[PDB]
Design a binder for these strands. Sequence first.
RNA 1: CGUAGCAUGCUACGUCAUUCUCCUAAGAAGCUACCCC
RNA 2: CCCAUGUUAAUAGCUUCUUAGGAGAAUGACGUAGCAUGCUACG
Lengths: 185, 186, 927, 590, 75
Amino acid sequence: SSLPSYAAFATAQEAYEQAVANGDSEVVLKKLKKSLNVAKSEFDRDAAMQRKLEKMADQAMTQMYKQARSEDKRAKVTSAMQTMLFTMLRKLDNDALNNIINNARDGCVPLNIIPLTTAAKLMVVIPDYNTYKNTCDGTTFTYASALWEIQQVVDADSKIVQLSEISMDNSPNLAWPLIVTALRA
Amino acid sequence: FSSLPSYAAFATAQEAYEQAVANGDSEVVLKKLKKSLNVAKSEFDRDAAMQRKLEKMADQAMTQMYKQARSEDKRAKVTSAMQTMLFTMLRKLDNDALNNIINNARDGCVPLNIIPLTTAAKLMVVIPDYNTYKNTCDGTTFTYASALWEIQQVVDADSKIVQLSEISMDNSPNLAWPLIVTALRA
Amino acid sequence: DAQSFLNRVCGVSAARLTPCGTGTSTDVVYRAFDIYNDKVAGFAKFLKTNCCRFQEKDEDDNLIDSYFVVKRHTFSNYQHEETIYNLLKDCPAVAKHDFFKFRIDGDMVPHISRQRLTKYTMADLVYALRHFDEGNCDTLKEILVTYNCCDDDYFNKKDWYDFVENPDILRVYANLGERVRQALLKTVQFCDAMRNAGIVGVLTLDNQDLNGNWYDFGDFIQTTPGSGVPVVDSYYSLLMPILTLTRALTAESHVDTDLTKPYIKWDLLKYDFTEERLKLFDRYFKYWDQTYHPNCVNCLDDRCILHCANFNVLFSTVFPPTSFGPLVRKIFVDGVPFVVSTGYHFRELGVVHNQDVNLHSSRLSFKELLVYAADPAMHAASGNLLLDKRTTCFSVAALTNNVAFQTVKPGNFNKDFYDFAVSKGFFKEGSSVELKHFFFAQDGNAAISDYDYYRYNLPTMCDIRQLLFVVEVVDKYFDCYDGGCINANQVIVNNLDKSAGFPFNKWGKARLYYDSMSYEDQDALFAYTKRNVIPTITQMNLKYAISAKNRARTVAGVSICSTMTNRQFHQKLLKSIAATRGATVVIGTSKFYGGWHNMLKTVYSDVENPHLMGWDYPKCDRAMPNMLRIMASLVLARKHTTCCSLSHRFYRLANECAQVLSEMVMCGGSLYVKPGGTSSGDATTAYANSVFNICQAVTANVNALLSTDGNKIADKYVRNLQHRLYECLYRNRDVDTDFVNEFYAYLRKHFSMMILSDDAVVCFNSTYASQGLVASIKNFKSVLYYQNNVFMSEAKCWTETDLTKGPHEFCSQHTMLVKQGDDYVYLPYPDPSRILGAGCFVDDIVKTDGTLMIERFVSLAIDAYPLTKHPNQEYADVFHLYLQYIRKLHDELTGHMLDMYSVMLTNDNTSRYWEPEFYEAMYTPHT
Amino acid sequence: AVGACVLCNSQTSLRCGACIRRPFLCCKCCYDHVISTSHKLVLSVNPYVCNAPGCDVTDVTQLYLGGMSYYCKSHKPPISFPLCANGQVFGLYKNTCVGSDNVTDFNAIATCDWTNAGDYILANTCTERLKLFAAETLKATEETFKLSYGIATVREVLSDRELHLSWEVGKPRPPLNRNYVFTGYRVTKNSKVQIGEYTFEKGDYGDAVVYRGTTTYKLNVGDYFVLTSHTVMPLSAPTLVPQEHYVRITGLYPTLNISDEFSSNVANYQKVGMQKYSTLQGPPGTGKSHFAIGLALYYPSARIVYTACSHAAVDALCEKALKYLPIDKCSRIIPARARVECFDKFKVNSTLEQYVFCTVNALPETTADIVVFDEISMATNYDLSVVNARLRAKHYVYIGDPAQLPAPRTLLTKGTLEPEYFNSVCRLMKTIGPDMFLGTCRRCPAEIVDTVSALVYDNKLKAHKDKSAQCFKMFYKGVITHDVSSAINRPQIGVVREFLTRNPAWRKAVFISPYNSQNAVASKILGLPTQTVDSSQGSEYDYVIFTQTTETAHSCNVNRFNVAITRAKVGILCIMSDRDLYDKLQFTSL
Amino acid sequence: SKMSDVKCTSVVLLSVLQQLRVESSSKLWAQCVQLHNDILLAKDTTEAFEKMVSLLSVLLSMQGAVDINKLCEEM
RNA sequence: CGUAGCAUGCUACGUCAUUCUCCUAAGAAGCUACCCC
RNA sequence: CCCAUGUUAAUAGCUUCUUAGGAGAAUGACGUAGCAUGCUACG
Ligand SMILES: [Zn+2]
Ligand SMILES: [Zn+2]
Ligand SMILES: [Zn+2]
Ligand SMILES: [Zn+2]
Ligand SMILES: [Zn+2]
């Protein structure tokens, strides 16, 4: 294992190999055998101590690794979950989830849970005449890849407006985050 | 275990052997010194093993005592906590009505299920919807357990207070419904 | 002719009669006899052919429910019954007979015409309510309709017979109340008019028409007047499960016992109802032979505790429910007043008082402090009154100042593994392996909309002359084990870092209380619970673990002052059950290392024509009646014939029944009263459930063997077995251990069983169970209907006609006969979707990491190895998916641990967890 | 525990523990930091000390790792390897650490103790991580400078209203003011625990304090008072968010016909809406703090957080907003301690309200829609990083002038700091130009604003006014008394009192004095409302009385006196101890 | 393979909503849990998506808890 | 040839060092049954 | 030569790792006995 005890073991083993090549002696051969054995015992004690140290320095490598990674994983979880969620939502590529996401990136958020049953109520803000021009048309409202009929369009002052004030020229006269309250159709 | 005299004997036998090697001592001196070195070395190694055994046993006993001291301290800490809890729950008792009803019993024993019903000064009614609210505690002074309770607070599921005029059949959906209404005996 | 006969049957009570049958001949009817003679014994449906029953129609030609049975028999029986009727004439509970001799064809036959009997005699009601079968119940629908309980549209409902899917059925059955109770009262008139007239007879059930009258005096020998004796051993003991199914003792709750009167107003502070219980017993069950001590602390042994306990579980449905529970008393400690519980008053074992009450004490040790901090006397007495309208259960108090709502957050997601799974071709459309086991979330009020399921626990008066034999057979099933009290220093706690009850979890885990108390004051506590009662709050908390259906799973954590003593009491028995291999209760037999094959080959203990069968108790831990839990805790406490006296084996039963059966559940910041049923959190729950399961199986066997047609049983040994089983049930009062041994040998030769707490597999002889001599499924449905009080639909109990396929599902692991080595073994394989659902959905965001948990996918692959031998392919791919994922996990682990440090692990031995030899070695019988 | 290097953001687990802030450092960067400076102590997951029974060598150019421990040369294992080698120091992630060339700036920031002027000019021009580390290290140095302060105790208790003092000999005396709170103890052989937090304010007569505090517990002889520092939490957010010129107004919706006063600020409002953050610069009293409220009134639907570094500035912004905004949608946030009183007119401490007003060091973790940071000449990079970390908004405004008085900078005692090194925003304004610039003094009379246009500006500021005949200067000397570094001048207050009843129209003339003790002791003499020049930024007063209390290098600075004089709405009386300042401006002789 | 990708995305989405401290609004957490449990049991893809839309609308409803413009911009 | 002294080789027992196996106890991490299908 | 600040049960089975103890086996060093052999001396 390349330590001085192994150097002594190696030179003693070479001497014993030379003796085996000769192989005609008893007393000096036995003395060489004893020297090889005692050097081997010393080397094996050193190797046992080093191997115990080397397998003790793995219960402090694995433990440190799975403490560092655990403390990294449970401290970065408010962001890992959100990045994972939007990765998966981009993976689904559904026509509805993508539509409500691509609207909610442009201010057009919904102010309550989007309903399911027909003729149920949804209140969604609209931040511009551009987003009102895309989603709305006449008394129809294309949101979450479904058509809704508009009940009310209340501006930021909570004063009800009609769907004829909202024109290209007459756009900037209102308080723009219009809450549109619509029913599912 | 170098402190024991066996280590000194092993060291001086090694020193004698090294002196024999350096001075080129004869076979008789070498064999005598080697025999002495062998017996001294074996005795020192046995002594070192015994020292390891004794030191490990002492460390085991020290850890045993420094764990039992922690255990015996935790015993006193939890005993203090239990005594504090018992005496606070004692001082919270409505110690007049309880005494009256207990001394009103034949042997001093009353079932536990009638200890709140006839002594507790506060009543928490938990209501799951509106029909139950209308049926059990309509108005401001309902009647439960043959006593006249008066409503003093109505908190909703997420612990927000609610004024008793917001609870109506046309405002029922807009609440968080399990409605803990806290009332007092009157 | 057939008109003079009708004119004679009309008699003096001029009633218009339409003849059932035809033409002065007998009418053959399928009735429900309770019969015992030399030929046949049992309680079964026979076919009676000696009754020319007419029907009485009132004005407007409506057929009212009142018949004229005209039983004809030998002349000797006619004369004997004439004298007996002339002795019992005056009492009201004797249907008016009319004896007349009529020329039938060429000679005079003597007829004994009863007058105005109802159609279905009482045994028919009891039979059709005990031996229910949803396909063939026409003698129960007709009884319910004809006594104005339900109006014949009730039976068009989807599940009208269920107790779990239709609780309103109870309101139907209760409408028979004052028709059964009156029956009971009329019996106590008859018995009196029997004893005062000197007649010795057997009161069978099938001689009482549903009005109450009695009409059969065949085998009534007569003796010196005023010294007769009526035998009601087998009358009050078949009618007993009907006295709380149909709630026949609620009219005893109204003042003057009239259903029109208002409720009675018992005093609030009245806890000793012993005189009232004795009054009820001497009014209804007067001529019941055995004694009856209302407070079971006076009882003789564990067979006079079942008897009096089952009586009290009926007599305690008329006393107010706000008078049970602990009995507090104001004591003084160093001149300051505590209120502590000095007893209990349970509806089953009466009133129990403590014998160690130390008023005017000075200090408090650790034992006394623990006892006073555990029991709910202080906690209820120092908390504000609560009225919870969300639950039909009681509501003792509210400890905090605001009710706490607990949610169950959704599980995490192991997206690395899910992307790996969809890489290897899983989770396609049409795959036989699909994600079904998810991590479900829960609303705010879940823990209190699940505790509400204890509304399924009705007070059931289990039959008592048959429970006192089923307990003997069950005890024979439990005869190989040894048990007893162990000293404090021999208790072995598996896990010590588990929370301890309500009042102790604010300060530490169970380790704190198992380390703080020395052995002396941990053994003084146990020698204290053997001489008085420690009531105990038990917390009810939601479990956060993978599942397959929405309903929240609440587990009950019992206080350390209860577990710390139940361990000492029950541990020798509970660690000799879990260390004996080859018995009925297979708990502690490993499914690895060829242990599933050994289970499945010690089930087939030489039964002639095997058919495997498995039932499933619905709401097992919430609908188990109180009496069966007491019987389970009395069979688990029969080993103490030397270590404990009798008054030490009664206060242990009272402590188990106060800390487990009927406790105070702390259910989200409020103390409710738990009506009954086992709380799966104490020391003896798997084993107590095993005892109860064996009790239901043996009860189904007894019912199936008794309720056969008697003379259709060709095997002249089994017929004698039935004829002696009835005798040892009802006509015998002490144990008959030779016959109990014989019947248990019959059971283990023809109904070999394998029990894991409710998971049963039975290897019943199929020829016998086809004849009816061994309980098939339908008998288990009936037994669960009248004893466990739930209906077990036949779509959740399986029957395997083959044996080279093993049990369909035991311990939630299917079984497959695979070829291993050179023989054939039964490998148990799990649901191949649960393994995926437990790989993808971990319950802690650190387990999402992957490379940390290789020693978790190793365990999952070990559990999912038997899938590779499945004949399907999408099942056999789950194991190889786990192997390839462990390989990827270790590759990226070494990548990260080489980037982090600069040298890889040296002594690394993870190269055997991704090769199938290691997993295959775990299903081979060597070790 | 691992982290990111400061100079290169690589992964690492080495903390150069000799530095005050204990920063993380990669392998190569730590090697360059220890090869150059005198910092030799590198705490890994376990500290790099010679793990011998007894041995104290902590340098990490010597220690060699052997077995599982680090040993010096005198106890080195027979088999081992040196740590500081191959151009690296052996820590975790030894092979994926890309070095950085900014090691010299890191050395200059970590080594210096913030006493030389060039330390600030270097700590405010480097990269973002170095800017954050420099600000964090300076705050840590300032807070640990309170560890060098003294300890008070009691010999006798005069009353429950006034307490006697006994300072511990051998430590400097902590000055008596609002900031330096005290905590009680009783270490007489038992109970070495805290009892409560009090505060000191010196009485007029003798050497005693009319103490106040959270509680009113009686101070026994064993009890005594010590001061402490809360913490220096590490900042993480960048000093300035990356500017991004949007195409159109996004996130803010304008209004029709805003008003009559703000009609000249619509262009600036739309410029603020266009960009991400914006910078406004103007001479004092020129609508800078009012243009922010006009922006709030021009974006009614936008949730706005106003914030300032001090309390008087945010309170003045509060009162002006209340004079211009509805109190239905308005709030204010105060701290739990609140060593100074607050503006209790809004519905105090409601975060969810649309218009949240606050101090930088007390902001909540919240979103907004546009946050107006006022007085960016009174904030260091710690304040900007806190306002960029705690709250997040779609539009930032930074409104203030470089030439005002800077942050106090306690640690600095040599040289004078140029304005363009005050903080990052002042650098952005004085180098590349402010985004908006409005100069016409709508505040001060033409006399004093004409005077202050000649001293601290290049005679360019103009105002719409004329001489108000209420601008007086009184030449005096005063006897200087230097108590606790909070200077007090005796006859200035007497002169004011003798010439206060001469003109009873100055009854509410707010008193401005550079030192806090003059302010505190002048309350019982004159009775006028009063404030300090450092907190004088933001508010406006009708008649002002500004006194150069003691002629030192403090009050001789032109910026402090300029900020003092440009607070006078209609009247100003200034008493000067400087010979030049009495003739530096141009007033009536008086 | 898109039916069993709405059962997992819904788990991640409800975990996100729970991390946004939506537990402390009982009337809203009841609806979020109901939509989660009804997504995980629905065997029809259209029903699962129409409940996933309503579950996501809770996340988009809260104005500035998540930062939707930054999150989606990583495309 | 016995005995004494010394030396060499061989068997039994004991001390120590190393390796391997098995078991017994204690501690920590994880999974499954349990739970509803 | 001084001035701003604080937002979650019981029981059972199994896998992996660590420590301690015991036993066994193998090798080596050493010690003490017993057996054989070789040399010198006295008798
Ligand atoms: Zn009895
Ligand atoms: Zn016992
Ligand atoms: Zn350094
Ligand atoms: Zn670096
Ligand atoms: Zn050293």
